[PDB]
Amino acid sequence: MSKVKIELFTSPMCPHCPAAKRVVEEVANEMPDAVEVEYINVMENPQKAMEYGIMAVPTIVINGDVEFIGAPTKEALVEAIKKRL
Numbered sequence: 001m002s003k004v005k006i007e008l009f010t011s012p013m014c015p016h017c018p019a020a021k022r023v024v025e026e027v028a029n030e031m032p033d034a035v036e037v038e039y040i041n042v043m044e045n046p047q048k049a050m051e052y053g054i055m056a057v058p059t060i061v062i063n064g065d066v067e068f069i070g071a072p073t074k075e076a077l078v079e080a081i082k083k084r085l
Contacts, residue, residue, distance in 0.1 A: 002064065003034040004085065009049035010058035010073065011042040017072045023060070026078050030085055 004027055008020035018025075020039035028035050040049070042057065049059045052066045060067055060074035062081050069076035 003036050004031050005036045005038075005061060005064045007038040007040065007049060007059075007061035008073065009038075009040050009042060009060065012058060012072070015072060019058075019073050022075070023062070023073060023078060026082050027062070027085065029082065 006020070006023050006027055008023055010019065012019060020037055024035065024037045024039075027037075038061075042050070042059075049061065049066065050057065052059070054066060054068050056068050058068050058070075058073050060069070060077075062074055062077050063085055067074060067077065
């Protein structure tokens with residue numbers, strides 16, 4: 001009971017991925033209101049996500065769970081929050 005929290009903790013620099021733009025559009029398809037997106041381009045901000053158990057960019061939160069899946073952002077799970085988050 002906090003709305004669907006997404007966070008985007010990375011500054012991808014080789015592949016200019018849509019990053020938070022995909023993750024927001026994808027979950028806003030599901031929940032066009034119960035959505036929170038921290039797009040935190042990794043620069044000038046604390047490692048508060050880059051701590052955790054993952055300690056490996058691209059550091060991504062979907063619903064509230066902290067993870068990283070691929071060279072791009074959480075696309076493997078984005079294929080499933082689209083399905084039944």
